[PDB]
């Protein structure tokens with residue numbers, strides 16, 4: 001609550017006239033310029049004097065002043081210092097104080113409700129987590145347009161004639177200058193004005209500022225912006241302006257957060273089988289639009305006062321937009337809230353594809369995408385191995401669905417051996433002539449006999465196995481949280497993998513209703529074994545399995561109730 005101020009050096013010769021800012025301790029320099037033994041001090045009834053009624057001239061006397069109420073006029077409040085001694089008659093040092101109030105209120109407590117600066121301890125350092133301090137900013141991503149902006153106010157109670165000899169200046173550091181825009185009740189601090197002179201009148205006067213952030217956190221911007229108020233002494237026309245008081249709030253720009261398959265959906269977008277999508281969406285109770293691809297992704301940015309969705313593209317609604325094969329949002333899945341060896345990741349962890357080691361022929365996601373994901377912190381990315389895939393996307397062999405038990409979810413992984421065992425269970429029963437089914441059909445007896453297909457699917461198993469162990473470690477996962485979806489592959493151009501039949505992990509999870517790509521499996525006794533196997537896997541967790549066909553569609557899911565600012569990266 002109690003902030004630190006300047007030192008006021010009084011002298012027995014002339015009197016001293018200082019200003020003191022309500023909420024700041026002020027130190028008094030009695031020992032300098034004093035003559036010669038002991039000293040008393042008596043002040044005006046609105047000046048609190050802590051010493052640490054008679055005291056000596058030892059230089060170890062911390063004389064500290066604080067003001068009790070803002071002033072009516074200049075030198076409203078007086079302070080007098082005695083410098084008596086044993087044989088010396090008391091010598092007076094005068095000090096005339098002028099109380100003022102200068103407070104920056106802004107939402108530093110992250111409760112939605114703007115609070116004054118003297119309400120935190122360290123107003124100048126932004127800290128994560130609950131019990132933390134630091135106001136939030138939303139990026140622009142594009143009256144009532146104040147809604148997507150932060151509130152910052154200045155409340156000042158000063159004498160009538162105060163700003164004749166003082167002035168207030170609002171200012172932002174030049175390095176943060178191009179990343180913020182501050183409006184007055186009109187742009188004051190901007191991307192080319194690092195400081196602006198407030199015209200404030202005497203007396204009591206609250207004036208309001210609106211702050212938007214102009215860019216997201218990144219390797220050239222850790223995400224902090226501090227706006228600072230400075231009180232300037234422009235009295236003595238000869239000498240320059242002397243600062244007498246500075247105070248500031250620190251904003252952190254809200255990062256972009258991504259949503260996992262396990263968040264409740266809100267809207268489905270799409271621009272034939274669109275009937276079967278509308279049907280799934282009807283059953284899941286969720287909105288759906290049509291405009292007459294997965295090169296975008298719909299996240300959200302969140303501050304106490306306003307949450308809104310934002311779309312990133314590598315026009316549509318979603319009130320906000322921002323703009324090799326591995327560089328696609330198909331190569332970005334987001335885990336559910338998890339805790340690994342005690343560390344909580346309550347907004348998930350972002351999984352993206354990559355090679356295992358860099359070579360000539362190895363691909364990687366562009367370094368500036370990886371660095372931007374990482375720069376948001378809140379969802380500590382996790383590099384995976386997917387370069388073995390023709391396309392390269394993580395979405396090609398993993399997905400998450402909601403479960404009512406264990407950790408509340410399951411990780412689906414594609415599994416060639418899961419499919420082989422099913423086909424072998426089928427052939428062992430005399431169904432090797434069951435034809436599977438991008439056209440040439442094959443009976444399962446041929447497919448299991450294909451020794452080459454066996455090697456591809458063994459190697460592919462080793463790839464997905466490698467990633468399995470990665471997910472286990474980086475997501476603190478127990479096998480009991482993993483469900484292997486039978487799925488075949490084939491190695492095509494440049495010995496990269498391709499989904500043998502429709503990639504069933506690449507599914508639409510709309511709450512508990514799954515739209516799964518129809519594999520066109522071998523029909524055994526009027527029931528496709530592959531569908532039957534996947535229902536058998538997912539229905540115990542109470543998912544509703546529906547098999548479709550095959551631009552695509554996207555999904556906007558409800559943001560986490562957990563507020564990113566309470567995590568501690």
Ligand SMILES: N[C@H](C(=O)N1CCCC1)C1CCN(c2nccc3c(-c4ncc(Cl)cc4Cl)cccc23)CC1
Pocket residue numbers: 139140141142214215216217218312313314322323326327328329330331332368369372373
């Ligand atoms: N200064 C700008 C800013 O903050 N603005 C612009 C005006 C509004 C606010 C930054 C925006 C973010 N921007 C990006 N940096 C990395 C990646 C990006 C991706 C992406 N593309 C593909 C994948 Cl798979 C993953 C990702 Cl995140 C999409 C879209 C933008 C991106 C860096 C410049």
Ligand SMILES: [Ca+2]
Pocket residue numbers: 329330331332333334395
């Ligand atoms: Ca994805």
